[PDB]
Amino acid sequence: YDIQAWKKQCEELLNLIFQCEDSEPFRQPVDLLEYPDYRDIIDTPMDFATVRETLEAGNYESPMELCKDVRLIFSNSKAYTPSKRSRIYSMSLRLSAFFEEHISSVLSDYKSALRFHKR
Numbered sequence: 001y002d003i004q005a006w007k008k009q010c011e012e013l014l015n016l017i018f019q020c021e022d023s024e025p026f027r028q029p030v031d032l033l034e035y036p037d038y039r040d041i042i043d044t045p046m047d048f049a050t051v052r053e054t055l056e057a058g059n060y061e062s063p064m065e066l067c068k069d070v071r072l073i074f075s076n077s078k079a080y081t082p083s084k085r086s087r088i089y090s091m092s093l094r095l096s097a098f099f100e101e102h103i104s105s106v107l108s109d110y111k112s113a114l115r116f117h118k119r
């Protein structure tokens, strides 16, 4: 019932993501010189270094806020891809499945800790 445990769990999950080869296109903001039309399609850029920095700054209040920003990395890739068979989009789908499989227990444990506190 540790209300704060999600933070270290998210740091460790980000470490696993940074080791995945599939995260390489998403570690840093998209290079707007290589993709000059990026901001014509994407309203809010997001990347894993920004997520990690926001977490380490103490600027997430819950793992649900972190999960919203990670999910934005994946929805941006889906919106930007010129094809559902593109290399970088395919990497995003695998990485999203890995993220979702690992974040589920983090969210469940956090919500359980809040409920126990309210009890």
Ligand SMILES: O=C(c1cn[nH]c1)N1CCCC1
Pocket: 025, 026, 030, 031, 035, 076, 077, 078, 080, 081, 082, 086, 088, 089
């Ligand atoms: O999400 C994409 C992308 C998706 N399909 N093709 C490119 N990018 C983020 C990193 C740079 C490109």
